[PDB]
């Protein structure tokens, strides 16, 4: 809260970088905190799936979750780093009228990019279906009708159920809907990568996800392939709940934490990460005057 | 599972039991799956991991609401005994009769209350209320929240001394505090001095790069100690692993070098039990 950028600043701030020569890479942050540590580290847009926000809830990924739980740590995110973000929803949770309220959720929190795949849930009472390529129009006619200052990508899991070829007719239908992006999952190979890239005419998303289908290729190598931008999703929640183990285990069986302490962020850093120093100056300014 | 009033008085169980309770601090409902998992009986919710959490500053910024929120996700998950810190009770009598509600719906099992004047002047600082003050929170908590387990938090030490803090500390045991917290006692004499003419089970501050020694929970439980806190230790070990994996991404352009510090999908698929809404989904499927 000391000192930004508005929505569609920073909407125009995310199209730029995806625009740019370079590949745009893009880590998850979980929270706030890893928000910042990203946004330290260098990387100039930031991510939130679905899939880490509901494990940092203690929750699994099968859409419990609310269209305005997600607008909140998307929020957060924002408010802390001021950084392009894009937000994992799903299938906009629900029919059109509410992905139109999810559209303008997110655009109230500030929220660069929005990420919408074609997956039919609810599913009936652990499968992979997808709705009519119609239906996805639909919510992106939506979304650029109701949020047209929102930066849009359409994923599509049509390579594993359907076919290569149903998933490119399904990428630039949803391409001359409204989406900027493609988020193609599960393409198997260097070939596909490429002919997924000339085929379609708009920028691949990389879902560069850890124990997934993908290879771990480098940010570099996705770039060569086709790709200009690329996300590690639930990286983030993936080293935290690690650590959490390892120093619960030290404490729990030794009795004491004192030997995960090179494994810990001092106080200093803490105290640098959270801008203290920037809300001490504030308080003091407005002291001294 | 558990209802409130089965929570606190575990939490009670475990503080007149003889072995020291360990309670961890849990900033999100995932560390606090794994404290679980690991074996411990009772979650902690620090103000100052939560706030750097989401990415604020420990200054009295957070509302109730929000901290009993991350509170509930806690217990929800764990159906665990927690100690939330809630700093002074987020402003006058009033707020924290609210406060004290709250909690009992998040299903709290005890809280904790300080010394601390809040807010601070326009001019780094450290100040209290009075002992009255504060008793008179303690005497709101006790009234409108008898379900709660209370633990009341005195910086008197480093400000006014042992002295005063011995004082207060009786005095909130009086107003209903079940437990005491001696903020930064100087010395092993300090510990026991006070846990001498301080009638009330005893806290201990666990934290890291502080001006407290690297006691183990046995070495504490040898000094009168009943229970021992480690608060803002699972965030601490969070950021120094996002500030790895993710400069060895900007740097590296891939993640491969750090698989060995990361928690495996299987892992992280039994872990929020995925299994059980599973045969959920199915039990309901095939009963019909």
Sequence with gaps: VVNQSTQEELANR???????????????????????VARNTGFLALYLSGAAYTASKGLPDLGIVTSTEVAERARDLVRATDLPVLVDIDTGFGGVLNVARTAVEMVEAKVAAVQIEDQQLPKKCNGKKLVTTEELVQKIKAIKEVAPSLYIVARTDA??????????????????????????????????????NSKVNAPLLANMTEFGKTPYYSAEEFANMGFQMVIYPVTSLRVAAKAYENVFTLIKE???????????????????????????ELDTGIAKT
């Design 254 to 280: 030794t009795g004491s934490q004192k030997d995960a302490l090179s494994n810990m962020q001092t106080r200093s850093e803490l105290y640098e990460t959270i801008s203290y120093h920037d809300f001490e």
């Design 159 to 196: 390579r594993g159920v359907e076919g290569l070829d149903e998933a490119i007719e399904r990428a630039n239908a949803y391409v001359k809907a409204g989406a900027d992006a493609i988020f193609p999952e599960a393409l198997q190979s260097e070939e596909e990568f490429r002919l997924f």
């Design 14 to 36: 995310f199209r730029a970088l995806v625009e740019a020569n370079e590949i745009l890479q893009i880590p998850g942050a979980h929270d706030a905190m890893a928000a910042l």
